Amino acid sequence: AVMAGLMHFKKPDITVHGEQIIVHPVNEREPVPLGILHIPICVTFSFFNPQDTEENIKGETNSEISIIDATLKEELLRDGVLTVTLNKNREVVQVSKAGGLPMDALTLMKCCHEAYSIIEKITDQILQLLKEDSEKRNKYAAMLTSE
Amino acid sequence: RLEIYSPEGLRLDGRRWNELRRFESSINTHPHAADGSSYMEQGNNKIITLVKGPKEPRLKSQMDTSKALLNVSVNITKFSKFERSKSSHKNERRVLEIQTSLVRMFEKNVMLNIYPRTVIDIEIHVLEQDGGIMGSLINGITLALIDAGISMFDYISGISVGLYDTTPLLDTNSLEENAMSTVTLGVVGKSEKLSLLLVEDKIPLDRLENVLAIGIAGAHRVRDLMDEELRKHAQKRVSNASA
Amino acid sequence: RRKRLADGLSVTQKVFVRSRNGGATKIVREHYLRSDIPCLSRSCTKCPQIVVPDAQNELPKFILSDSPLELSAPIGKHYVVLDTNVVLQAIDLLENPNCFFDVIVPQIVLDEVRNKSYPVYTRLRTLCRDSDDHKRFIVFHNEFSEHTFVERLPNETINDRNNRAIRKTCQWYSEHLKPYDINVVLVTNDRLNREAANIITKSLVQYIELLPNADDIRDSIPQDFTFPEYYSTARVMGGLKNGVLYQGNIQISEYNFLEGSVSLPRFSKPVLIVGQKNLNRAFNGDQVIVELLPQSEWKAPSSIVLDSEHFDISDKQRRLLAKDAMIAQRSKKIQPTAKVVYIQRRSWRQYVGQLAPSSVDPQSSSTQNVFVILMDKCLPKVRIRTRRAAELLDKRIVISIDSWPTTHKYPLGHFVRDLGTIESAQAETEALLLEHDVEYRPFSKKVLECLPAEGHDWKAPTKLDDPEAVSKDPLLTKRKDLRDKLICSIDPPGCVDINDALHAKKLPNGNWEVGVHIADVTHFVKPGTALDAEGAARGTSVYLVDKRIDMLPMLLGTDLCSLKPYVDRFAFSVIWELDDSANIVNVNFMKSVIRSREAFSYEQAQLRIDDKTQNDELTMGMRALLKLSVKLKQKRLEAGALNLASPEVKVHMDSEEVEIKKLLATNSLVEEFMLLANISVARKIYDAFPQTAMLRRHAAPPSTNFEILNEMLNTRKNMSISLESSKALADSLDRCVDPEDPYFNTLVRIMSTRCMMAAQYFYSGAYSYPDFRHYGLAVDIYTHFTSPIRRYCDVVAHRQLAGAIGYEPLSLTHRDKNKMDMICRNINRKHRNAQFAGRASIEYYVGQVMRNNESTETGYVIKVFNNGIVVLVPKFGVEGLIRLDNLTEDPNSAAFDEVEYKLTFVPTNSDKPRDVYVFDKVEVQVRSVMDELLLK
RNA sequence: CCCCCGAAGGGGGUUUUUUUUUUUUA
Ligand code: NA
Ligand code: NA
Ligand code: NA
Ligand SMILES: [Zn+2]
């Protein structure tokens, strides 16, 4: 929501004469968008322990279950939670595993990569929907200039 | 800009890429102030950790009939850095995030369920700071909790690893933490399983796994150190108590 | 106190006090001591065992020679331990191939040198990095070794501690290498040691004299006229805070080395600085601080040609003097002047020159003082001490400038290297490349290892679905197959590296499909690699008249990346859908695989196009591209473009000529689509990365550069140019036509372009969007994309275009503004230097041809002075300076009319008054005598 | 369900600053 909003947002054009600035309503000058450098997207993995805690701490054959984008019913019953933020530059923007059920490192890595697979789709979707919005706005203007 | 990593493979402090800072710990340092306690030095990091409990809940709220309540208080003193901070840190969102992180870390390690209707208060004072402070907090908590005789499944070793270009640097100090992205790890015992995984700045995905690899290893060493202290402190205070 | 640790390790606490401006802050750090620091000697047996691998799992190479240079007793088997000062003063001798073969560089020395001079530190690090059989430089971390680490005593300055640390380093070295008998010589100039319980301590000159080849290198070491001494730091900063003084970089006049100027922010024109004293030992390009002179000493811009060879109070009133300076700068002939009072920064690179015959004495066997005349005619002559004067007499040499005291009329310097006899191809070429700091050394093996292991045996995969080829390259699936396209390349006859290739085919829409295909260099060069580093350092390929200095190794440029015909080659392809009016209705950017059907020359392509017997589909596509290019160019002309093709001249005598490129329609054909490509790519990559897009802009010039020229014009030709808009200047240029001389117009366009500002590379975040505009091309945005083999800008733009289309995630190094800033400044400097080098080489060679072969050429007087004229031979695009002595006998009688731009003189060969105006068509001839361009 | 009694009753779940434009190019 925050990213799509920031990319959709436009501040009014302005110009500056020393001490003073001149701010414009839409009729005066067109608004200009903000400077977006990259598009960070978060994916949240939920971890469930199917067996006992003893198996998690000192047991082989890790049975720890991981799911993506848990519902409220799932979120209320989870034993662990990881949030990974990535962008289309294959950058790990951030990672947060603030405690919870101990998970094997390799599993967490796999989570990161699958998350990337998802943020590709989501990013392309955001860009697409944005451009469609702008195009529809333009075509509306074209419908307004001539009845 | 300066040689964070020289071609010779040395750092500013004179360490190599895979070497921990000086790590020393002391147990039962405040017997009159808390049930468990630890004083810890990691590099220039100096931390006092106090564990009070298990004890009767202050309020007759905050009482859980099935398990103990675990609270963590992190006091970052104004004199921990070179430049004194005119502002307190106690209610900063960073500190709250750290506190909740440590709590949710040791909720899954400490057997709270065998201490129902009790409260375990963890009181931490960071006397001196020099980067990698999160892992230090983790280690201090582990030591102090073990000193308190409070049951837990295993050690939790905290460590930090920076990423300079292609090469990862183990246990970063303050200068290294700046001008570099760092990963903090909370590793359970000798396992490969992570209690904590913290990345707060941008890192190339394809190089993240490698950073973890050394990190875990480092953490293991840290465990071996903490362990090594405890046993000694045990061996000393179980022999002298005899006769 | 220090603590011992687990594995031969230790720790202490380095405590000190940092003094940031206006404050005090005590700093505490942990200093670890070690027992595994290698001496890096091939003779040592103990150290290779205790050594440990780095982060790459690598055991540091022991490179110091088992048998070093051996001297006379009490010195045998010696290594050299340097001091900071010795490095700072003799850095250029430390680089000399025939001395200092085995040198130990202590860590603390490295740090000191770094603190006092970063470039010298970079050169020293370069020495330690490129160590081989010829030269061996190592770095020893004496500070991290417990064996050598000394701790600071109370009440002792940092210097004593540093030198005691170097001393302890030398001591440990002697004690460590003595079982083999390797001694160490601490070379220093600072009176370090009062006899204590030792080490060989010799100064620089002393160590030089103990050498076998002393006479060769003895003079490669730094050593009532009175300049006003520079102001103090407190005085100049105080003067800057009060607005009394002004800082900026000084540019010396092109034809007068004693007239300079400084660009100032609020001043309309750059403030003049005239005379030796006012210049005050400043050099061209130096960053200086200047003070405004009284109106009493304001001067008109000099009309004199002067060479180093031909040259023997109240504050309020000061700022109001700045006011008067501005207001007189706008409207007065006599411009306000200034004087330099402090040098903030100094170029002082190595300078190529030649000894002046006047100052030498062949008879004298003893050391003597001689003068060297530098190639750069904006610089003074330098004083050198030597005994090899009679040997260096007619040889191009390299010198270094050490200092310029107030007592000396000229700067003091020392000899560095002999490049060869004058008028030697090798000597003049190397001198030329050195004068413009062009890297011409061969690529290192670390670079050659970045090349594909296949080599020339590299092939583009036949089928792209090949599980093997995709196993080696996943991104290959996005690569589009355009091998069905009839693609051809058009280039000069001497061409070897093909960057561009074009195609055109008709669409059922009635529209045109036009493909511009560029060498996919990105696929071979990767960020971080040594190849990309050397390719980044070399901003572009430098093109001399005989030789070409490549940016990338040949294998890439001559073969793998080049769009050679008849073979499959990878490319980055810009495909267009055009209207018949050549308006863009569609555009796509795809990485592709192609196969060029033909590699045409310009006149080959033109011939084939005009040839009506050939009607093959390829030829049809070429004709299409032609007419489309014509339409594009018309649209750009109406847009207000100011494009001007300069004469391209190359030679190739090939044994023991001056071929001239002709103007053909195919030139336009290629040019227009290259432009289109660069534009589209610019827009796309800017849309992708709006902050770090690799772009190229051309700023609009102030009216000054132009109305000196305009002044000349309507003074003599009764013509003018409008500077209001690009199109204004364009059509006002179209107005400028002489009836009896059809070529004059193009000349006007040449000088006009010379008035314009320099174009520059930049990342998009550094400027606002309306500053992206390219004033010359009359477009809002532009970059370079079409030539990645020979420019690094195209490489960056290629990577960013790859990132734009989702083919591959853009490198971090092109997403960080600082690194890109460094890159842009570097490629700007390298581009400019390449241009200068090219022009210089052309001038030299053309001069040599006109001299060897008695030849008459046409020329145009483009500048007039009272003691010389500067003419332009147009067919070479070459300008030259004719001196009055040379131009005429009896120069004292000659008259200079500044308003009419006229020089009246009597020609030497036989007399009759001759008036020479600016813009005059003259006949030029070349004969070279000494004590040279000439007028026919 | 634990607690007594004896053979059922009573009580209890916890309210950082290491120091001259452009294009193709041997
Ligand atoms: Na652990
Ligand atoms: Na280790
Ligand atoms: Na080569
Ligand atoms: Zn040794």
The CATH number covering residue C875 comes to 2.40.50.140
| Sheet arrangement for strand C183-187 | C136-140, C102-106, C78-82, C183-187, C200-202
The DSSP annotation for C367-388 comes to: -EEEEEEESSTTS--EEEEES-
Q: Residue C19 CA to nucleotide D19 C1', Å?
A: 9
User: Are the Cβ atoms of A37 and C809 closer than 8 angstroms?
Assistant: no
Distance C124 CA to ligand 3 centre (A): 26
Q: Residue B143: nearest ligand to its CA?
A: 1
Distance CA(C156)–CA(C434), nearest Å, equals 45
Termini Cα distance of chain A: 35
Q: Are residues C482 and C571 in the same domain?
A: yes
User: Are the Cβ atoms of C691 and A90 closer than 8 angstroms?
Assistant: no
Interchain CB contact of C139 with B (< 8 Å)? yes
Distance C854 CA to ligand 1 centre (A): 88
Interchain CB contact of C60 with B (< 8 Å)? yes
CA atoms within 13 A on the CB side of C536: 20
The DSSP annotation for C383-398 comes to: EEEES-TTTSTTEEEE
Q: Are strands C271-274 and C259-262 parallel, antiparallel or unpaired?
A: antiparallel
The tokens describing C932, both together, are: 């040279």
Q: Are residues C860 and C845 in the same domain?
A: no
* Chain D nucleotides covered by protein, CB below 7 Å: 14-26
The CATH number covering residue B77 comes to 3.30.230.70
Q: Are residues C770 and C781 in the same domain?
A: yes
Q: Residue C501 CA to nucleotide D24 C1', Å?
A: 11
The tokens describing C558, both together, are: 């001559």
| 30-89 in chain B: CB under 8 A from chain A | none
Q: How many CB atoms lie within 10 A of CB C347?
A: 12
The tokens describing B100, both together, are: 């909740």
- State which residue has its Cα closest to the C1' atom of D24: C491
3-state class (DSSP) for residue C485? coil
Contact C901, C699 (CB under 8 A): no
User: Are the Cβ atoms of B100 and A98 closer than 8 angstroms?
Assistant: yes
3-state class (DSSP) for residue A65? strand
Q: Which residues contact B134 (CB under 8 A, 6 or more apart)?
A: B98, B101, B158, B160, B184, B196, B198
Q: How many CB atoms lie within 10 A of CB A36?
A: 12
Interchain CB contact of B204 with A (< 8 Å)? yes
Distance C452 CA to ligand 3 centre (A): 14
The tokens describing A78, both together, are: 């989870």
Cα separations in angstroms, C874 against C545, C838, C868, C878, C887: 17, 16, 19, 7, 20
Of the candidates C47, C215, C239, C268, the residue with the CA atom closest to the CA atom of residue C140? C47
| Number of domains comprising chain C | 5
Residue C294, preceding peptide bond in cis (omega within 30° of 0) = no
Interchain CB contact of B195 with A (< 8 Å)? yes
Distance CA(C657)–CA(C651), nearest Å, equals 6
Q: Which residues contact C627 (CB under 8 A, 6 or more apart)?
A: none
Sign of the Cα torsion C84, C85, C91, C95 reads negative
Per CB-CB distance under 8 Å, the chain A contacts of C810 are: 89
Nearest nucleotide relative to B61: CA against C1': D15
For B98, nearest residue in chain A (alpha carbons): A98
Q: How many CB atoms lie within 10 A of CB C913?
A: 10
φ and ψ of C127, to 5 deg: -65, -45
Residue that finishes a domain, picked among C224, C248, C275: C224
* Cα C654 → chain centroid: 29
Interchain CB contact of C144 with B (< 8 Å)? yes
Distance CA(C561)–CA(C554), nearest Å, equals 10
Per CB-CB distance under 8 Å, the chain A contacts of B153 are: 53-54, 57-58
Cα separations in angstroms, C70 against C139, C174, C681: 22, 15, 61
Q: Which residues contact A110 (CB under 8 A, 6 or more apart)?
A: none
Per CB-CB distance under 8 Å, the chain B contacts of C32 are: 13-15
Q: Among all chains, which residue has been given the structure tokens 């750092």?
A: B11
Contact C539, C830 (CB under 8 A): yes
The tokens describing C599, both together, are: 């590699």
In a domain, C508, yes or no: yes
φ and ψ of B118, to 5 deg: -130, 170
What type of residue is C601?
S
Termini Cα distance of chain C: 86
Nearest nucleotide relative to C774: CA against C1': D21
Distance CA(C1)–CA(B232), nearest Å, equals 25
The tokens describing C132, both together, are: 């081989």
Q: Residue C555: nearest ligand to its CA?
A: 3
Contact C592, C619 (CB under 8 A): no
Contact B167, B193 (CB under 8 A): no
Residue B54, preceding peptide bond in cis (omega within 30° of 0) = yes
**CA angle (C296 as vertex; C294, C302 as ends), nearest 5:** 100
Q: Residue B131 CA to nucleotide D10 C1', Å?
A: 66
| Percentages (nearest 5) of helix, strand, coil residues in chain C | 30, 25, 45
Distance C551 CA to ligand 3 centre (A): 10
Q: What is the CA radius of gyration of chain B?
A: 18
Nearest nucleotide relative to C489: CA against C1': D24
Distance CA(B174)–CA(C29), nearest Å, equals 10
Distance CA(C790)–CA(C551), nearest Å, equals 6
Helix axes C792-804, C665-688, angle to 10 degrees: 50
Nearest nucleotide relative to B85: CA against C1': D16
In a domain, C326, yes or no: no
For A112, nearest residue in chain B (alpha carbons): B205
Q: Are residues C456 and C490 in the same domain?
A: yes
Q: Residue C647 CA to nucleotide D25 C1', Å?
A: 13
What domain range includes position B105?
1-243
Per CB-CB distance under 8 Å, the chain B contacts of A79 are: 108
What domain range includes position C451?
421-854
Interchain CB contact of B94 with A (< 8 Å)? no
**CA angle (C661 as vertex; C655, C552 as ends), nearest 5:** 70
Sign of the Cα torsion C473, C535, A38, C768 reads negative
Q: Residue C45: nearest ligand to its CA?
A: 4
Out of C690, C691, C809, the one facing A89 most closely (by C-beta) is: C809
**Helix/strand/coil (H, E, C) string of chain A?**
CHHHHHHHCEECCEEEECCEEEECCCCCCCCEECCCCCCCEEEEEEEECCCCHHHHHHCCCCCCEEEECCCHHHHCCCCEEEEEEECCCCEEEEEEEEEEEEEEHHHHHHHHHHHHHHHHHHHHHHHHHHHHHHHHHHHHHHHHHCC
For residue C811, the 8-state DSSP code is P
**Helix/strand/coil (H, E, C) string of B14-75?**
CCCCCCCCCEEEEECCCCCCCCEEEEEEECCEEEEEEEEEEECCCCCCCCCCCCCEEEEEEE
Distance CA(C866)–CA(C255), nearest Å, equals 12
- State which residue has its Cα closest to the C1' atom of D15: B60
For residue C457, the 8-state DSSP code is G
Q: Residue A18 CA to nucleotide D6 C1', Å?
A: 103
In chain B, how long is the greatest CA-to-CA distance? 62
Q: Are residues C709 and C577 in the same domain?
A: yes
User: Are the Cβ atoms of B166 and C528 closer than 8 angstroms?
Assistant: yes
3-state class (DSSP) for residue C297? helix
Chains touching chain A through at least 3 C-beta pairs below 8 angstroms are B, C
Mutate to test the interface with B, among C2, C4, C29 (most CBs of B within 10 A): C29
Dihedral over alpha carbons C194, C200, C203, C209 (to 10 degrees): 140
Distance CA(A95)–CA(C357), nearest Å, equals 73
Q: Which residues contact C391 (CB under 8 A, 6 or more apart)?
A: none
Distance CA(C719)–CA(C709), nearest Å, equals 10
Cα separations in angstroms, C660 against B99, C648, C876: 77, 7, 8
Distance CA(C605)–CA(C502), nearest Å, equals 12
The tokens describing C488, both together, are: 């051809």
Q: Residue A119 CA to nucleotide D15 C1', Å?
A: 49
Per CB-CB distance under 8 Å, the chain C contacts of B9 are: 53-55, 58, 60
Interchain CB contact of A146 with C (< 8 Å)? no
What type of residue is B79?
F
Distance CA(C495)–CA(C487), nearest Å, equals 17
Q: Are residues C608 and C719 in the same domain?
A: yes
Distance CA(C164)–CA(B204), nearest Å, equals 45
Per CB-CB distance under 8 Å, the chain C contacts of A35 are: 690-691
| 16-55 in chain A: CB under 8 A from chain C | 35-37
Q: Are residues C7 and C138 in the same domain?
A: yes
Contact C309, C373 (CB under 8 A): yes
Cα separations in angstroms, C253 against A13, C261, C275, C379: 44, 8, 12, 10
Cα separations in angstroms, C386 against B159, C208, C483, C817: 63, 15, 65, 48
Q: Among all chains, which residue has been given the structure tokens 């202290």?
A: B229
Distance CA(C802)–CA(C809), nearest Å, equals 8
Mark out chain C residues that contact chain A at CB-CB < 8 A: 690-691, 803, 806, 809-810, 812, 815
φ and ψ of C439, to 5 deg: -70, 120
Q: Are residues C25 and C144 in the same domain?
A: yes
Distance CA(C261)–CA(C253), nearest Å, equals 8
How close does chain C come to A120, measured CA to CA in Å?
Answer: 10
3-state class (DSSP) for residue C728? helix
3-state class (DSSP) for residue C653? coil
Q: Are residues C776 and C909 in the same domain?
A: no
Give the residues across from C395 on adjacent strands: C421
| 808-837 in chain C: CB under 8 A from chain B | 812
Contact C570, C564 (CB under 8 A): no
How close does chain C come to A86, measured CA to CA in Å?
Answer: 13
Q: Residue C847 CA to nucleotide D20 C1', Å?
A: 22
Q: Are residues C541 and C658 in the same domain?
A: yes
Q: Residue C66: nearest ligand to its CA?
A: 4
How close does chain B come to A1, measured CA to CA in Å?
Answer: 21
Contact C10, B21 (CB under 8 A): no
3-state class (DSSP) for residue C69? coil
| Number of domains comprising chain B | 1
Contact C288, C282 (CB under 8 A): yes
In a domain, C328, yes or no: no
Contact C550, C650 (CB under 8 A): no
In a domain, C324, yes or no: no
3-state class (DSSP) for residue C834? helix
Q: How was this structure determined?
A: X-ray
**CA angle (C408 as vertex; C404, C412 as ends), nearest 5:** 45
In a domain, C325, yes or no: no
Distance C788 CA to ligand 3 centre (A): 17
H or E stretch covering C843? helix C817-852
Q: Residue B117 CA to nucleotide D14 C1', Å?
A: 9
Of the candidates C581, C589, C667, C642, the residue with the CA atom closest to the CA atom of residue C773? C642
